[PDB]
Paper text:
Galectins are small, soluble lectins characterised by conserved β-galactoside-binding site (subsites C and D) within their carbohydrate-recognition domains ([name], ~130 amino acid residues), and they can form multivalent lattices with membrane-associated glycosylated ligands. All the observed CRDs of galectin family adopt a typical β-sandwich fold composed of two antiparallel β-sheets of six strands (S1–S6, S-sheet) and five strands (F1–F5, F-sheet). Concave surface of S-sheet contains conserved amino residues and forms a primary binding groove to which specific glycans up to a length of tetrasaccharide are bound. In this model, the best structurally characterised subsites C and D are responsible for recognition of the β-galactoside-containing disaccharides, whereas the other subsites (A, B and E) remain poorly understood regarding how they contribute to ligand binding interactions.
Specifically, [name] displays the highest binding affinity for [name] (Kd = 68 nM), an ~1000-fold binding enhancement compared with that for TDG (Kd = 75 μM), which contains no substituents. The [name]/[name] complex had the greatest number of binding interactions (similar to the number for the L3/[name] complex), including salt bridge networks and van der Waals contacts in the principal β-galactoside-recognition subsites C and D. Specifically, although the aromatic amide of L3 and the 4-fluorophenyl moiety of [name] are both sandwiched between Arg144hGal3 and Ala146hGal3 in subsite B, the [name] substituent extends deeper into the pocket formed by Arg144hGal3 and Ala146hGal3. A fluorophilic microenvironment is thereby formed in which the terminal fluorine atom of [name] can form multiple, orthogonal polar interactions (namely fluorine bondings) with the protein backbone atoms at an average distance <3.5 Å. A displacement of ~0.9 Å of the central carbon (Cζ) of Arg144hGal3 guanidino group seems to accommodate the longer 4-fluorophenyl-triazole substituent of [name]. Moreover, the 4-fluorophenyl and triazole moieties at the other end of [name] form tandem arginine-π interactions with Arg186hGal3 at subsite E. The fluorophilic interactions and the arginine-π interaction in subsite E probably account for the 50-fold increase in binding affinity for [name] as compared with that of L3 (Kd = 3.3 μM). The manner in which the 4-fluorophenyl-triazole moiety of [name] is situated in subsite E is a consequence of the salt-bridge networks of galectins, i.e., Asp54hGal1-Arg73hGal1-Glu71hGal1, Glu165hGal3-Arg186hGal3-Glu184hGal3, and Glu58hGal7-Arg74hGal7-Glu72hGal7. In the complex structures of galectins-3 and -7, there are similar tandem arginine-π interactions between the 4-fluorophenyl-triazole and Arg186hGal3/Arg74hGal7. By contrast, the interactions between [name] and the B subsite in the galectins differ such that the number of interactions decrease as: [name] > galectin-1 > galectin-7.
Numbering used by the authors: 113 to 250
The structure:
């Protein structure tokens, strides 16, 4: 029953084997969801499911450096559904963010921001009811 947009501090930044778990429910008639792993004003990893882009479902991933978005990485496999509960797991690897949704691997995102310890906040926003957001070391 948390509040969106939600800020989850990541003390000391991210590190390989860190597992971030977000539990929530997609709102009815949802338009978009966004996870933003931030390094100061930069966004190291933007994870952005879009429910209506040209009447398609798509997940857009990108990095924002000095107020400029970079080249998008798109995943057409779309495991979110309006009205339904979800679990997003982000596993930090040495070279990638690894994303699984509802216990099924979804995508990996190669680190463009390479100072992982400086990625110290996770912003959670968009059309969801947020149930929980936490992290653990596996
Ligand atoms: O990069 C990610 C960002 O993108 C722009 S939209 C973007 O604008 C560009 C022009 O400036 C391009 O038109 C781009 N594009 C690429 C392609 C394409 C590329 C390759 C192949 C192919 F076929 C098609 N088509 N169009 C658009 O996606 C969003 O505003 C932004 N954002 C999202 C949010 C946000 C805020 C609150 C909640 C939330 F969920 C998200 N707050 N900022 C963020 O998600």
């Amino acid at each position: 029953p948390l509040i969106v947009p939600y800020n989850l501090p990541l003390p000391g930044g991210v590190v390989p084997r860190m597992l971030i778990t977000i539990l929530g429910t997609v709102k009815p008639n949802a338009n978009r969801i966004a996870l933003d792993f931030q390094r100061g004003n930069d966004v190291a990893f933007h994870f952005n499911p879009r429910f209506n882009e040209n009447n398609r479902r798509v997940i857009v991933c990108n990095t924002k450096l000095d107020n400029n978005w970079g080249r998008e990485e798109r995943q057409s496999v779309f495991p979110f559904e309006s009205g339904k509960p979800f679990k997003i797991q982000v596993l930090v690897e040495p070279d990638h963010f690894k994303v699984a949704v509802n216990d099924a691997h979804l995508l990996q995102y190669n680190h463009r921001v390479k100072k992982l310890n400086e990625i110290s906040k996770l912003g959670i926003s968009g059309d969801i009811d947020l149930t929980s957001a936490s992290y653990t070391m596996i």
